[PDB]
């Protein structure tokens, strides 16, 4: 009916409060902070063996294993130290857009255009990987999956919704429906009580896995959002968009802090991850290479150019001793 | 050197061998999209096969294995997942010749998006004009000017069909590295698979020549 009137009124007073909170700027504060200096990484191992484009990775908690999803229908679990493979899971649907690694190491998630989140069980009496549950009820295509523990998972589909599942009973237990475009990224907070989701509506939302309803939204981009990641402490999150720009917010202040841009890049961002200390902000562009940003000085720091196609995914180990980037060149490079 | 890491690398080599022997077997099949605008008979084209989400259909004709990926239940923004089908051999398109009730331009608009897309610069587009019987039964007591007022031609099945085929064909903006095969099927025709087979083998010859460098 007329509900749009009070909707926009609440939006406007929200903006007013946001203006009331901006009493300082990161640019003003970082006046005298030493630049991080030019870092120079290099390929250490090359994890070849895929036969098509790679769409996602995720590091284990031990910082030695990693799982990569491709369109060849395979879900390889590598061993980053010695490059020899461990498992090769053949999927029932070759179209995969995401993968995940449970913190305990027992389970691996994988979903795609089939919009069924299949949880794969690794450690069993018999020695082959089996699929445990097939989570369904989504009406779109899965974009990202993350494990809270061995019993709970959260998905994000193109049906403009994100949902918290329950692996045991296989029933949706809380649906987050306040968004308005195709969701394409998730990032659980380290304390595992609240997560964000950046989507095609040029807006990022942070939820509350208990109340099951968004607590604050962010609107600062000119186009769709492709990757999110929580800042390690748990009070910030970086974003990537198609408009060659990454942005870093903070939650307790509900504002923006810095914007990373350069006139020499007109490509899009595909994945964003932080370092252990938060001083470095990795971001995998689709102009055939990754970039390294100083999350405070806003200037470019390093370049990771070793691929022959779009960089489609990257991640940083828990111990902070490595970074891994995947690309549509069917390869998977690990840096140090 | 190793204690049983030798056994570990042996397992790695074995599953690498399995990955090749599976990739070489999944690379023999030829892949096809199956798009469509609305109620166009993509269901009927599927029903001419021999033997939620994305539904697949596998069938073999004359010792050639096919795969037809059907989307359309995936009601979402195309630009996010259309880049997954980059290496498909062809895109079997389907429109409805009896589309004057639509409240056809939507199909005509859609064809422009997928034929001139940035990921399909070198992918042939088989085009299936459907419901020719309905066209014949309908144009006898109606103008074609409803879809195109500026059209200046007779009101007869052959002329109308030729004009509409040309009208879809000229939307192609990259006339050099593509090809738009066209066919006028009906709900009773039984050579649609044969036409698809001919188109796919022609595209295979094209790709082999362009790889060998002659083309």
């Amino acid at each position: 009916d007329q509900l749009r009137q009070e909707a926009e009124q609440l939006k406007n007073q929200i903006r007013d409060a946001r203006k009331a909170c901006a009493d300082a700027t990161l640019s003003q504060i970082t006046n005298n902070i030493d630049p991080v200096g030019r870092i120079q990484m290099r390929t250490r191992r090359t994890l070849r063996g895929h036969l098509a484009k790679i769409y996602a990775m995720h590091w284990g908690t031990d910082s030695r294993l990693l799982v990569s999803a491709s369109q060849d229908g395979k879900l390889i679990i590598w061993d980053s130290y010695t490059t020899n493979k461990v498992h090769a899971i053949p999927l029932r649907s070759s179209w995969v857009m995401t993968c995940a690694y449970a913190p305990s190491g027992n389970y691996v998630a994988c979903g795609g255009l089939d919009n069924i989140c299949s949880i794969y069980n690794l450690k069993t009496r018999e020695g082959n990987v089996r699929v445990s549950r097939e989570l369904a009820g989504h009406t779109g295509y899965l974009s990202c999956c993350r494990f809270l523990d061995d019993n709970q998972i959260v998905t994000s589909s193109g049906d403009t919704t994100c949902a918290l599942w329950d692996i045991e009973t296989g029933q949706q237990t809380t649906t987050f429906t306040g968004h308005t475009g195709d969701v394409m990224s998730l990032s659980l907070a380290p304390d595992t009580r609240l997560f964000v989701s950046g989507a095609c509506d040029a807006s990022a939302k942070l939820w509350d896995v208990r109340e099951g309803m968004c607590r604050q939204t962010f609107t600062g981009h000119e186009s769709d959002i492709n990757a999110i990641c929580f800042f390690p402490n748990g009070n910030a999150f970086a974003t990537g968009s198609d408009d060659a720009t990454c942005r870093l917010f903070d939650l307790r202040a509900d504002q923006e802090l810095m914007t990373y841009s350069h006139d020499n890049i007109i490509c899009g961002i595909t994945s964003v991850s932080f370092s252990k200390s938060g001083r470095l902000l990795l971001a995998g562009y689709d102009d055939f290479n990754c970039n390294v940003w100083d999350a405070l000085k806003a200037d470019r720091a390093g370049v990771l150019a070793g691929h022959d196609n779009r960089v489609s995914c990257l991640g940083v180990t828990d111990d902070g001793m490595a970074v891994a980037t995947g690309s549509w060149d069917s390869f998977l490079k690990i840096w140090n | 050197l190793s204690a049983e890491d030798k056994a570990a690398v042996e397992r790695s080599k074995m599953i690498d061998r399995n990955l090749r022997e599976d990739g070489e077997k999944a690379a023999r099949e030829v892949k096809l999209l199956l798009l469509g605008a609305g109620e166009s008979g993509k269901s009927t084209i599927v029903k001419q096969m021999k033997i939620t989400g994305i539904v697949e259909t596998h069938f073999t004709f004359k010792d050639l294995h096919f795969k037809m990926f059907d989307v359309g239940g995936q009601r979402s923004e195309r630009k996010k997942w259309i880049h997954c089908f980059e290496g498909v051999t062809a895109i079997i398109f389907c429109v409805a010749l009896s589309d004057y009730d639509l409240v056809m331009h939507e199909s005509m608009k859609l064809f422009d998006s997928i034929c001139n897309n940035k990921w399909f610069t070198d992918t042939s587009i088989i085009l299936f004009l459907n419901k020719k019987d309905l066209f014949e039964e309908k144009i006898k007591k109606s103008p074609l000017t409803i879809c195109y007022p500026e059209y200046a031609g007779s009101n007869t099945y052959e002329e109308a069909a030729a004009y509409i085929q040309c009208q879809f064909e000229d939307l192609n903006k990259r006339k050099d590295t593509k090809e738009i095969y066209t066919h006028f099927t009906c709900a009773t025709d039984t050579k649609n698979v044969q036409f698809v087979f001919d188109a796919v083998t022609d595209v295979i010859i094209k790709n082999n020549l362009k790889d060998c460098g002659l083309f």
Partner: single-chain antibody
Amino acid sequence: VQLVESGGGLVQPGGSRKLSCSASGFAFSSFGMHWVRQAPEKGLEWVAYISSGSGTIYYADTVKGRFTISRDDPKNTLFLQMTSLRSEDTAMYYCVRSIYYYGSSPFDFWGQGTTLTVSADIVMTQATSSVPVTPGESVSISCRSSKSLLHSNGNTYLYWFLQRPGQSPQLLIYRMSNLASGVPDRFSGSGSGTAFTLTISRLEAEDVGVYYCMQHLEYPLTFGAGTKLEL
């Protein structure tokens, strides 16, 4: 999860026999399998081995040449061939599986066993025969190797085994530290380089038996003499 073997009986010296192990209940093709023996009132001694896919095969020096071993994946069966049976071979033969990848648990499962009656390397010495105990208090068992088992890669290759009276042995801990599945979280293991210790926290009635030490670094797999926790 279910291995049963057959082929035993009585043989004449210098003769021949075939041994078969029927695998039913797991992915046989991706598991390597071994063969270990037990002379009466004696310990364990490694015999043979096949890697997954029959890629690599090793043997034991005392049975080299006159034993040949092979497997048939589609039928899920393990074959061991007896030729020229000597006299120091009367033993009850076991059928043990093992898979090798990062974080795996080799020697997970052990078959029942069959009796075959015929009428320079690593050395492990547990140096103890029997320790008397009562239910309730802790107890420790020691093991000693010839050379340091700590491979430079980072992990130490020492296994521990348990054998209830009249039963097939099972695995307690692997890599000196990690517990095995289905084992109560009251065992433990420790040590460094050459000295090794196993510590039961609070004994129970179902723990009396003989415990065996075993290395895996050099490939000839020598076992221990045998330690009995006869209550």
